[PDB]
Each structure stands twice: as structure tokens, then as C-alpha cells.
Nucleic acid binder design. Structure first.
Ligand code: ZN
Length: 1369
DNA sequence: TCCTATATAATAAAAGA
């Protein structure tokens, strides 16, 4: 009403003294000098006379001239025609002959390979194109109504350009060059060709509106590995021929950093030439951002850059691509190589340093790239956002705001000739002034109560309108716990027209409807559903009960208004707040979050880079109707985003910054040193102090610091130059976090516990000292303080095993408990029960109770084997230590040679050919990249080659080092190890990832000697992991050739499901795969598609077709629709058919192989319960104890134990496990991969007792050994959850039914697929069908729904969706 | 919206109330 007045910017009256520049009053900085317009007084024009803009072009740009309308419509084409330089593009040529240059979207482009390099080697060039987006007018353009600039206009501009432009004499215009290319083509008879670009639209857009001419009309499409804009692009200059000298070359190449590129590329914007602003005239030398900043500003004198219609959009989008690429490359080029080594190691090396010895010291570290989109930067932002939630608790309010193009402030400023779409600068500046005002109201004015913490991220839509998502964590006093509070903040109904007319109009247009969420929300094909026909229903109450985990607000039926000749009721009014909507006239949606799980989904807004789209380029021939089509997946940048990034405007803001503290052993710190300056490091080392060491000094000299614990010191002090100083500026609170340390180093784990609970430590000695008595080790000190976990559960588990009387298993149980579970005192258990553990060894070696030596040693050695695989040693656990024995893997050379000869004879013809190529490469002495990828359907053929190759190489005396991506795959291969263990790659795997293996370590020597390295499942391996293997191999060898010139055999099948990513769309997922990595070019493909099926050869052929998406028989009914063979479909209950009518303890072994597969985990849990009920037996309930590892005692209050019990994150055991004798169970942890236990290893329960479960292995090498599985501590694999849940439960899950993606490696004799809803991934259906060898053994049941079931109404046949991404295969 | 392989340790740079 009168009280609420719309926010007014106040006009552009204010101007800076240093330079004339019209700026809004709010934008003025505190100092009084505007940074963007002139960098204070630092930026000034050079003293060169500035020519006036030519009159004829100015009259055309304004509407005054008669032919002005035509000029504005064709500005993109006219500018390109008179330009002196061109951009290269790669397009396939029909008939093998193409014109030298072709026109795409109104800009001249030249085929890659038009200029052949004098060196004779052609650099790879990334592809960047400018796309018009609104090519709906192509049909009118094709029609000869005008669409030629009227001819007279072209002649008049051409005459003006020659008279006023000096460059014309030196360089020919593109329009003349294009004619010459056509003339050469005409003589050869090469046909004229037309090139067109199309975008497959994404499902995210404003409802019913996309690609609006008003929202955007120009964009850059670019493809690069990490989404960074490409530095290397091809620009070719055509030079007018000189009669005097034939030496001059017509084609020369200029890089993105050529000095006068701007004047050459865009002639209309700078007509006079390389004079005035076209030449370098910025003074006091000026960075690229500063130059663009000066030009894109509004001043009284006419500015060509902001008043040129479509060209203005192209200039801004092209300039952002050039500026970002130049900054990223310059920073990377000017980077010193850095190496990190511990202080103890460097000092030891220096004392024993060999004179004149060149040895690399330490591990290489690669510093992060500047671009925000790069993976490492994004991961840090997510971790920082997560800790604000952990400390301040669950978020209370989520608010989203979107720009309105018809806002009064944007319209009044625009001059009559300009249109909102043509000028991007005003939209970005007005939005920033408004967002800052709303942000201030919420926090500075305490709107919606006191706000403690805030996170805000701005993302641009395909239309290009900017929208910002804000999350607010309120203080405890104002937290919303009542229906009365929820109603005042959020309202979901149409306002009374008489009571509040202005509000009624704002709600009527901005928030009238929400797109119905039925497969496609934006598409208006569901016209009825699009407006007022959506999920919300008349609840009639605030009901903040989290029924579905989302509160449902009050909606009352019976109120409706007329919009677009339609009636929309209270069913669909997006939740809106009155004061905010009245003040800023734009769509503001306020929603309340009442579940911590709701944030888990919402936090993913901060994980994106640029918008992702799919573009297909087609070349067509007029003479004959021949078209060639190619598919490119590339990032998209709109014009409004580019102006936002070019100016210094923030895209992410967090209220509290985070400082990371360090936990280090007493003599080991971290020093980072440049490789060349080794001598300086020795002097610098004494001075360097890490955060922990500094804390000791602050305690020694300051009384006040004693009160705070080590974790809280960052909040009250700041670190500069290796010292801590008090902070008196009232600066942004910094939270402070301590990292988590793993049990692999026991002392460091004990140190973390002491720092968390001990305060006022003068020096390391004080931390160990407790109650006036020093203790020799950190572990002893912790026990006396009493901050250690109880070991009662472990003692009981060991006692039960002794009663069982099976000795070998008891020794294994001790190893599994110590490595995975954390035992405070392992030594005590071993000493008390030593006789029971070593009883078997005593009986065989020394008859009955004989007295001899090494009986204990033999027992300890068996336990040590499990420790070696995980990397721990017996000394760490304080067990008695005996020196390790030595054995040789190669064994008999004669035996390996004889076995190899027989295997070679049985190989198939395609297989034999592969053996010959791999053997030849090992013999060849030339230094050339030697990487081979073995393709072909996943199956028996690939494994047999690995066996024959290993035998042949061992026979010649060389060594092979087999490794595999998954634990189950590793068990099959001899001596299998997970590739993440062999090369010790970091678990997050960001772009800057380096292997932790030491160059001089014994393991490194083994990799150097090995002739061949084999990876069983490349499909699972991500691009980052393959890159890290390349760096380590290059470092160990002296060569710089890819992969150290070592033969590699990364066999894999790409039809199977790709590696899961936390959030991505089709365009995002394809780029991270091995195919889009740079090293892929060197790889040479060997094909092994010969099919090896014991029976039902027809079934194998059908599987390949489903995987390749070649089945198009029913595609006519719908896209991606296939028909299952009739015999397989089963109306009857899938449980009865797949597992058999009879399920009993007596016959469980016969039906053990069979299993049921379902797409979503929820359905799987329901099926498992029913089968368990039918089985005879008595239910035993094993409960679990769950805790959150935390740096703060209060953090536990925010997430209560009752909440932790309910959550069951993927890859973790259930809180309440119900199991009965004869059930099938699957291990969820690798444990001992070599012996047989793995990520699968399904077992049949034999006996169940408290604290111990006895099972028999149904799959893998063990095949029937009896293993006892103890409780172990399991932690969530994903980092999405804010807290780290440590839950101890038997690592087991009921396994009668498994999700399709958990069954990639298992082989099942009979399988039944139950599909409640259609599949949603890369290889989902293919994996489910592939498990069974023959067609008769698959039974499928489909539930009828909108997209699946009997799609033809009169046809009794069932159709299901098959999803395959064509680009990956 | 969903699905979840591996399973240990986490960067050099100035400046404000
Ligand atoms: Zn200025």
C-alpha cells in the first residue's frame, strides 16, 4: 500500500571527477572514486588525436537513416563481411571436396587445414563458435525477401571504408576472399554447400518460454576438458598479393594475444582503423580487464560499443572468452615448479647429501588453476559450505529471486532506438543494486529475525535472466517452530483484489503458475497442466509435520481470477512473501526447510560450472541432397553472464570464511620449496613455524590464550609470517576446522584426540605430561587422561571364537578387527589368549604339545599378510615382531614356458592377433607412445588373453603387474590388487592430484622394471585417475613420453554403466569419461568382438544390440522404446518364479545362484523382507551403535542420536539388521581381497550367535571356505552429508534382491528383472540382461505406467524404456 | 528425484573500522 514504496535506483546523475561517467548513486564506493569506470585516476587516454565517429554509420545505427532498419537486422553479417581476419572451424566435407571458406550463422569461417604448417606438424585446436540461438528466422532468411542488405547499403559502406581505413590497402576484406574461394571451387566443379547449427534443448527453462529474442540472441559454444574457455583458437589473416614480391604468403596465423586483434575482427565498431581507440591508447601497460572496463561504460559522448545492436552482444560474449583464457594461461605459465618434503627428511638428506648428485627430492605438487569452475575450487567451496551447516545447525529459510526485464529502472534509462535485449550492461548493473538491497534487509535490518549465517549463489538460465538462490540459518531465539510464525513469513493464496490491488497484480503476472512436474514441466504440450494444474492440493492447514519431509502450506479452495482467458484457483500460487514482493516487483519464492535431509538435496546448487548444452553441425549440398551430421557436447555462455564476469561482480558469498589448522608429528612439519633454490630451504627451515608449533609459542607468552582450545584459536587470532597476533578489527568470524586422521599411523591418531580435549600446552612435552608425570608415548598419555574408547565389545568377540574351537578363523578374525575396527589395546588380547591362537601350528610342527621355536612366529606371519595389503605393520599394533620371510613369485621358469605354449594354441584367430601385437611392442626399442585399449563385449574373451600374456612374459624372465578397478575383478586376475592401492592415488581425485608413492621407494622400483601394466576395468576409471598414472610413470622413468613409454593394456567395455557422479546431466557426464581426456589420442584400439557363448548364440547377439541402442523396431511408437521377447514377460509374482515356489534351509544351496534385480533401492528393501518371512527360522535382531566424529561437543546436540539411527546412506549397513539361518548376505567392505572376501562375496548363513556370524562363500576363489565375520566400523562413502557417521555393525546386508548397479560383476544362473518405473542411466537395462548367459533364464515383469507397459492400447505386448548415450560408445 | 567403484589424507601470494 502507501507504506511500501518500490526501490528506486535514483537515476544516472552522479559522475566521477577523474573521467565523465554516469553511475547510479548507490554504486558509489565509500572513498568517492568509482573503481570500474576509470580505476580511480589510474586509467587515462594517451595523447593521440581521436577521430570523430563517421556520420553515415552513426545515422544508420540510430533510426534516423532510411535504410536503418535493414542495417540493424543484418549488423552481424555486414561486420563480418568487412572484417580483415577469420576464425577456423572443423567440418566434414561431402564428396571429399569443399570450398576454402564456408558461412555459418552470418560469420565467415574457414575449414581447419586450409593453411598447412611450414613445420609440417599441426597443433590440435579446440572449437569455439558464436551461435545466433534464435535461428527460427532461418525460414524467412532462406526466402529471398531482402536478406541481402539491399545491395546499395553494402556499396555505400564499402566506399566509406576504403576512404577512411588505412588497413584496407595492407589486408583484403573477407567479402573479396570468399568470392575467390567460390571461384576456385566452381572451376573444379565442387558443389556449393550450406552449414547449419542446431541445439538440442535442455529441460530447464522459464515455463512456456525459451530462446526469447528479448532474453538473449548471441552465445559462445566452446568444448574443453575442465570447462575452462580455450586459449588456443585458429585466427587466419588473408593478405593482399604484392606484384613486387611473390615471397609474401597469402595466409598467416595470429594467436589470441595479437595486439590489434579487436580492430581487425570487428570493423564497424572501430571504423577509422588502427587509430584512436582501435590502437593501444589506454595509458598508465593496462590489463585486459581494465581496457574492457573503460569501453563498456555509459558517457555523454556517442559510444559505438554499447549502441550497435546485435554486434554489442557478440563483442561482450567474445571478449569474456578471450579475457578468461588469457588470464588462466598467463598465471599457469608464470608458476615456479614446487616440491613438498618433511623437515626431518630434508635435514637427513642434507646431512647425507651426495656431492654432485642430481636426484628429485620429495613429491611434486601442482597449484590450483584460477578459474572457479575447475574441480578443485568447487570441492573447497562445498566443504566450506558444509561446515557452516554443521556448526550452526539445520537451515530454516530458502529464498530465490529472478530478474524482471520490464522493471522501471531498466526501461527509463534506455534511449528510444536501443532495445532491452541489445544492451546487456543495464540488466547486470540494475540486478546487482537490487540484490544488495534485499540482502541488506534480511541481515542488516534483521528481517525474518536475527540471521547468523548466509550462503548465496547466482546462476544464469538459458534465457539469460539472472537468478540468485539464498539460504539463511536463523539464530535459536527466532527459529520457526510454530504454525503462527510460518504463516506470517510465507503465504500460498491469491490476495483479496479490493484489500491489496497492487499485490494482486504482482502475484497475477509474476507468480501465477508453476510448471506441472509430470516428466517435462516447462513444455506447454500439457497446456491444462501448465497453468493451475500441479502437485499442490488444498491441505487447508500449515501442517509443518514433514509428512514427505517437505512442509505443505495453507491453501484454501474457492478463490480464483481470470488470466489469459483461463481461471487459475488457489491450487497453484507459488509461496510468496508480501513485503518483499511489494518492494521489489519480481518473483520472490520463500519456502521453509524442516528436514536436515532436505538440505542434503538443496546443497548441490553450488556445484555447477557453465550451462551445458548439446550442439549438432550439419553440412548440406544444394546440387544433391547429401547431409553429414556430427555431435558435439559443449558448455554455453550467454551475453548477460559475460558482462557480469567482465566487471568485478561476485557469484558466490559466504558469511563465515574457514581457516584450516594442521596436525603434525613432533619432528615432521611441511616445507614447500622451489626446485632450483634448494640451498635457500636449509636456512628458511629453522624460521618456518606450522600452526601447531605457533600455538605453543602463543601459550608461552600470553595469559589470555590459555582459556581457548586449539580448534577455537583461529576465531580470536590471525596468522601472518609464522606468528599469531590478536584481531581487533571485528573482522568476519572465521570458523576454524581440524582435519580427520586415519588409524594407519597410530601416534598421529592419538595426537588428534589430545589436541581436541587439552588446552594451554607450553610445548609438545606438556601435551604428553598428565598430572605432573610425563609419559613416553602419546597413546599412554591419552589413556591416563581417560579420553579413549572402551574395548569391551572386542574382548567378547575374541572369547566367542575360542569357544568355537576353529583356530585358523580366529587368527583371521583378529586381523580384520585390528585393521578396520580400531582396537585401543590389541597387545593385551594377544598375550592373554596366545595358546588358543597358535594351537594348530603347535600340533603339526612339534607333534602333541612339543616344545620348539618359531611356532608363534609362523602364526604372527599369517596375520601379517592381511596387515601388509592394507599397509599397516605388526609393530604399529605393539604385537611381538619377527623379521619377514622372503619368497619368489616367478618360481619355475620351465613350468611357465610350457603352460604358455599350450595356451597359445587354443587362442581364437582375433585373440591370437592381439597377442602378436602386444608381444611385438615389448621387443621394439623405439621410444614412441605405446598404449593399447582392448575393446569388445564384456565377457570370457578378455580374461583369457590376460592369462596367456602373463605366462609368456614370466617365461622370458620379465615381470607383469596386473591390477583392476574393482575388488571382485581383482580376485579373478592372478595377484590382483585394486589400482587405487597399487599407485596410491588420492580418494577425492581432483584435477591437481599426484600419487603419494615415493620415487625412491621399493614399490617404485617394481613398477620401473615391469614390462607390462594391465587395468581390468577402464570403464570405471575416471579421466583424472588415468592422468595421475601418467604423471607417476613419467616421473619414475627419465622419459617425458606419455605413460613413460611402457606397454599398457586398459581393456574395458563402454556399454556398461559409467562411473556415478554426485550431480550431472548427459552433457556434464560424457566430458569426465576417458573419451574426452587429452591422452586418449595416443591410444590405439585393438578389437576383440568375436563372441564366445557356450549356448544360445542368438541371445548373445541380442544383448549386443540392446547395449548399442540398435533396436529401433518400436522407436516409431516413442523415442528409446524397445519390446521384450514374449516368452520372458511374466504377469505372475516375480519372487515365486525367480527363487522357486519352495524356499527352505534344506534346499537353500540349490537356489543359491538365483537373484532378483530392481532399479531403485526402496523397492529392493521391501522385496528382501517378504522372502525372509517365508524362510523357516527364528529372527535375530542385531542393533548398532552410531556416533558422529566431531571437533565440537555442542555439534552433537544439533544432530541427535535419534536422527542418526533413521538415516541409511548408500554403502552402509542398516541400523536394525534382521537375519535368519539360511539367508543370503553380501559383504559391504573389501576386507582381504586376495583371499576371496570382496565387495560382493555373497554368503549363505550357517550359524548365528551374538557378536559372531558364520558363513560359507558362494562366489569367488574361496568357493566354500567357512569364514567368521566380526563387527567392523563403517563410515559413509559420499561426502554429501554434513556429518561423518561412524556406525559399528556386522558389514552385511540381506542379498536376495540387489539393485542393478550393485550387480555389475556378479554372475547369476537365473535372474528376474522387476521394473516398477523405467530405467534412468547409461547402461542400466544392458547390465541386468547380461548376467544370464541364455535367453530362457531371464524373466521380466513390468508395472503399467505412463511411459512403460502396453503402450499400444489394442496390442497385448509390453514395452519398456532402454536408455543409451550414443556419444560415449 | 533416482544409482554408488575406490576407502587415505588435504597448496606458494597484501590490506583497511
Ligand atoms: Zn571515472
Amino acid at each position: 500500500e502507501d507504506a511500501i514504496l518500490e526501490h528506486s535506483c535514483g537515476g544516472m546523475t552522479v559522475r566521477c571527477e577523474f573521467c565523465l561517467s554516469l553511475n547510479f548513486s548507490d554504486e558509489k564506493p565509500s572513498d568517492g572514486k568509482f573503481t570500474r569506470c576509470c580505476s580511480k585516476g589510474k586509467v587515462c587516454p594517451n595523447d593521440i588525436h581521436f577521430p570523430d565517429y563517421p556520420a553515415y554509420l552513426k545515422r544508420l545505427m540510430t533510426n534516423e537513416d532510411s535504410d536503418s532498419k535493414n542495417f540493424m537486422e543484418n549488423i552481424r553479417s555486414i561486420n563480418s563481411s568487412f572484417a580483415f581476419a577469420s576464425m577456423g572451424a572443423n567440418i566434414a566435407s561431402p564428396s571429399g571436396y569443399g570450398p576454402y571458406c564456408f558461412r555459418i550463422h552470418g560469420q565467415v569461417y574457414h575449414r581447419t587445414g586450409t593453411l598447412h604448417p611450414s613445420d609440417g606438424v599441426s597443433r590440435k585446436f579446440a572449437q569455439l563458435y558464436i551461435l545466433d540461438t534464435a535461428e527460427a528466422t532461418s525460414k524467412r532468411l532462406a526466402m529471398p525477401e531482402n536478406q541481402g542488405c539491399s545491395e546499395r547499403l553494402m556499396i555505400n559502406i564499402n566506399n566509406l571504408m576504403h576512404e577512411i581505413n588505412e588497413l584496407t590497402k595492407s589486408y583484403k576484406m573477407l567479402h573479396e576472399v570468399e568470392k575467390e574461394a567460390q571461384s576456385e571451387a566452381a572451376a573444379k566443379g565442387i558443389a556449393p554447400t550450406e552449414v547449419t547449427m542446431a541445439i538440442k534443448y535442455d529441460r530447464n527453462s522459464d515455463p512456456g518460454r525459451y530462446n526469447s529474442p528479448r532474453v538473449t540472441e548471441v552465445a559462445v559454444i566452446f568444448r574443453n576438458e575442465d570447462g575452462e574457455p580455450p586459449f588456443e583458437r585458429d585466427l587466419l589473416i588473408h593478405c593482399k598479393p604484392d606484384p613486387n614480391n611473390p615471397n609474401a604468403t597469402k595466409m598467416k596465423q595470429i594467436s589470441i594475444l595479437f595486439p590489434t586483434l579487436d580492430a581487425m575482427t570487428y570493423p564497424i565498431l572501430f571504423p577509422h582503423g588502427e587509430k584512436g581507440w582501435g590502437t593501444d591508447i589506454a595509458l598508465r601497460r593496462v590489463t585486459q580487464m581494465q581496457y574492457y572496463g573503460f569501453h563498456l561504460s555509459v558517457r555523454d559522448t556517442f559510444n559505438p560499443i554499447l549502441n550497435a545492436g546485435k554486434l554489442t552482444q557478440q563483442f561482450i560474449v567474445d571478449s569474456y572468452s578471450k579475457m578468461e583464457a588469457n588470464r588462466i594461461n598467463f598465471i599457469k605459465a608464470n608458476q615456479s615448479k614446487l616440491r613438498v618434503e618433511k623437515y626431518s627428511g630434508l635435514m637427513d638428506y642434507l646431512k647425507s647429501r651426495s656431492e654432485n648428485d642430481n636426484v628429485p627430492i620429495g613429491k611434486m605438487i601442482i597449484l590450483p588453476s584460477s578459474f572457479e569452475g575447475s574441480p578443485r575450487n568447487m570441492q573447497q567451496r562445498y566443504q566450506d559450505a558444509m561446515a557452516i551447516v554443521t556448526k550452526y545447525g539445520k537451515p530454516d529459510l530458502f529464498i530465490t529471486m529472478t530478474c524482471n526485464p520490464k522493471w522501471a529502472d531498466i526501461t527509463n534509462n534506455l534511449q528510444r532506438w536501443q532495445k532491452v535485449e541489445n544492451r546487456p550492461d543495464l540488466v547486470a548493473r540494475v540486478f546487482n543494486i537490487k540484490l544488495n538491497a534485499l540482502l541488506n534487509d534480511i541481515c542488516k535490518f534483521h528481517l525474518f529475525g536475527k540471521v547468523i549465517a548466509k550462503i548465496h549463489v547466482i546462476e544464469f538460465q538459458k534465457r539469460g535472466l539472472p537468478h540468485a538462490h539464498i539460504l539463511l540459518i536463523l539464530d535459536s531465539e527466532s527459529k520457526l517452530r510454530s504454525e503462527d510464525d510460518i504463516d506470517r513469513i510465507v503465504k500460498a493464496e491469491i490476495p483479496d483484489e479490493d484489500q491489496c490491488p497492487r499485490l494482486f497484480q504482482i502475484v497475477k503476472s509474476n507468480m501465477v503458475h508453476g510448471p506441472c512436474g509430470i516428466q517435462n514441466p516447462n513444455s506447454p504440450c500439457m497446456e491444462n497442466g501448465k497453468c493451475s494444474k500441479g502437485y499442490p492440493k488444498e491441505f487447508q492447514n500449515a501442517t509443518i509435520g514433514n509428512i514427505d519431509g517437505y512442509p505443505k502450506y495453507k491453501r484454501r479452495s474457492g478463490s480464483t481470477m481470470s488470466i489469459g482467458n483461463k481461471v487459475v484457483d488457489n491450487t497453484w500460487i507459488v509461496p510468496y512473501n508480501p513485503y518483499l514482493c511489494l518492494k521489489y516487483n519480481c518473483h520472490i519464492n520463500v519456502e521453509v526447510c524442516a528436514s536436515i535431509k532436505s538440505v542434503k538435496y538443496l546443497f548441490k546448487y553450488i556445484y555447477k560450472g557453465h550451462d551445458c548444452a548439446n550442439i549438432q553441425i550439419s553440412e548440406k549440398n544444394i546440387i544433391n541432397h547429401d547431409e553429414v551430421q556430427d555431435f558435439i557436447d559443449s558448455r554455453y555462455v550467454s551475453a548477460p553472464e559475460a558482462v557480469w564476469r567482465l566487471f568485478a561482480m561476485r557469484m558466490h558469498d559466504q558469511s563465515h570464511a574457514i581457516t584450516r589448522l594442521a596436525i603434525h608429528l613432533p619432528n615432521d612439519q611441511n616445507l614447500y620449496f622451489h626446485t632450483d633454490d634448494f640451498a635457500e630451504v636449509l636456512d628458511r627451515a629453522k624460521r618456518h613455524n606450522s600452526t601447531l608449533m605457533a600455538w605453543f609459542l602463543l601459550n608461552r607468552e600470553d595469559s589470555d590464550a590459555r582459556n581457548y582450545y586449539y580448534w577455537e584459536i583461529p576465531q580470536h587470532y590471525v596468522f601472518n609470517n609464522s606468528l599469531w597476533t590478536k584481531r581487533r578489527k571485528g573482522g568476519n568470524k572465521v570458523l576454524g576446522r581440524l582435519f580427520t586422521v586415519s588409524f594407519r599411523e597410530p601416534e598421529r591418531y592419538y595426537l588428534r584426540l589430545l589436541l581436541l580435549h587439552v588446552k594451554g600446552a607450553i610445548s609438545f612435552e606438556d601435551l604428553r605430561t598428565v598430572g605432573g608425570v610425563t609419559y613416553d608415548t602419546f597413546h599412554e598419555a591419552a589413556k591416563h587422561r581417560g579420553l579413549l574408547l572402551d574395548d569391551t565389545i572386542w574382548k567378547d568377540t575374541i572369547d566367542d571364537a575360542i569357544i568355537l574351537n576353529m583356530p585358523k578363523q580366529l587368527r583371521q578374525l583378529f586381523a580384520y578387527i585390528c585393521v578396520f575396527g580400531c582396537p585401543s589395546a590389541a597387545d593385551k588380547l594377544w598375550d592373554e589368549n596366545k595358546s588358543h591362537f597358535i594351537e594348530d601350528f603347535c600340533w603339526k610342527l612339534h607333534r602333541r604339545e612339543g616344545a620348539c621355536v618359531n611356532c608363534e612366529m609362523h602364526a604372527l606371519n599369517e596375520i601379517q599378510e592381511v596387515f601388509t595389503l592394507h599397509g599397516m605393520k605388526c609393530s604399529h599394533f605393539k604385537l611381538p615382531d619377527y623379521p619377514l620371510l622372503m619368497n619368489a613369485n616367478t618360481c619355475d621358469q620351465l613350468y611357465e614356458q610350457q603352460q604358455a605354449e599350450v595356451l597359445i594354441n587354443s587362442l581364437n584367430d582375433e585373440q591370437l592377433a592381439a597377442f602378436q601385437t602386444i608381444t611385438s611392442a615389448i621387443e621394439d626399442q623405439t621410444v614412441h607412445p605405446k598404449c593399447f585399449f582392448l575393446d569388445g563385449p564384456g565377457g570370457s574373451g578378455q580374461t583369457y588373453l590376460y592369462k596367456v600374456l602373463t605366462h609368456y612374459i614370466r617365461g622370458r624372465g620379465g615381470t607383469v603387474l596386473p591390477t583392476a578397478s574393482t575388488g571382485i575383478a581383482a580376485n579373478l586376475l592372478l595377484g590382483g590388487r585394486t589400482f587405487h592401492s597399487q599407485y596410491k592415488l588420492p580418494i577425492p581425485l581432483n584435477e591437481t592430484s599426484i600419487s603419494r608413492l615415493d620415487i625412491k621407494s621399493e614399490v617404485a622400483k617394481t613398477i620401473k622394471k615391469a614390462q607390462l601394466l594391465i587395468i581390468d576395468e577402464c570403464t570405471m576409471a575416471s579421466s583424472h585417475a588415468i592422468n595421475a598414472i601418467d604423471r607417476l610413470l613419467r616421473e619414475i622413468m627419465n622419459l617425458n613420453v606419455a605413460f613413460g613409454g611402457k606397454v599398457l593394456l586398459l581393456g574395458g567395455d563402454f556399454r556398461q554403466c559409467l562411473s556415478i557422479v554426485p550431480h550431472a546431466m548427459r552433457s556434464a557426464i560424457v566430458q569426465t569419461s576417458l573419451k574426452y581426456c587429452n591422452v586418449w589420442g595416443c591410444f590405439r584400439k585393438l578389437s576383440l568382438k568375436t563372441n564366445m557363448r557356450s549356448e544360445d548364440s542368438a541371445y548373445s547377439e541380442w544383448l549386443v544390440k540392446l547395449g548399442d541402442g540398435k533396436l529401433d523396431s518400436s522407436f516409431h511408437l516413442g523415442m528409446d522404446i524397445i519390446e521384450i521377447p514374449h516368452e520372458m514377460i511374466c504377469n505372475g509374482s516375480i519372487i515365486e518364479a525367480t527363487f522357486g515356489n519352495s524356499i527352505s534351509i534344506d534346499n537353500i544351496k540349490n537356489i543359491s545362484k538365483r537373484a532378483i534385480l530392481c532399479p531403485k533401492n526402496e523397492h529392493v528393501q521391501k522385496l528382501n523382507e517378504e522372502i525372509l518371512d517365508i524362510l523357516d527360522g527364528d529372527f535375530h535382531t542385531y542393533l548398532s551403535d552410531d556416533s558422529i566424529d566431531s571437533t565440537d561437543d555442542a555439534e552433537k546436540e544439533n544432530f541427535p542420536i535419534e536422527f542418526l539411527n533413521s538415516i541409511t546412506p548408500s554403502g552402509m549397513p542398516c541400523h536394525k539388521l534382521k537375519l535368519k539361518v539360511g539367508a543370503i548376505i553380501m559383504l559391504l567392505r573389501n576386507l582381504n581381497s586376495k583371499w576371496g572376501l570382496c565387495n560382493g562375496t555373497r554368503f549363505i548363513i550357517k550359524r548365528l550367535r551374538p557378536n559372531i556370524i558364520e558363513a560359507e562363500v558362494l562366489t569367488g576363489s574361496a568357493e566354500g571356505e567357512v569364514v567368521l565375520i566380526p563387527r567392523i566400523d563403517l563410515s559413509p562413502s559420499d561426502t554429501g552429508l554434513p556429518f561423518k557417521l561412524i556406525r559399528r555393525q556386522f558389514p552385511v546386508m540381506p542379498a536376495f534382491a540387489m539393485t542393478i548397479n550393485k550387480s555389475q560383476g556378479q554372475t547369476l544362473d537365473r535372474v528376474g528383472i522387476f521394473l516398477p518405473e523405467p530405467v534412468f542411466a547409461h547402461g542400466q537395462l544392458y547390465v541386468a540382461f547380461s548376467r544370464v548367459r541364455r535367453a530362457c533364464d531371464v524373466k521380466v515383469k513390468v508395472v503399467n505406467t505412463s511411459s512403460q507397459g502396453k503402450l499400444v492400447k489394442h496390442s497385448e505386448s509390453v514395452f519398456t524404456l532402454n536408455v543409451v548415450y550414443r556419444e560415449i560408445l
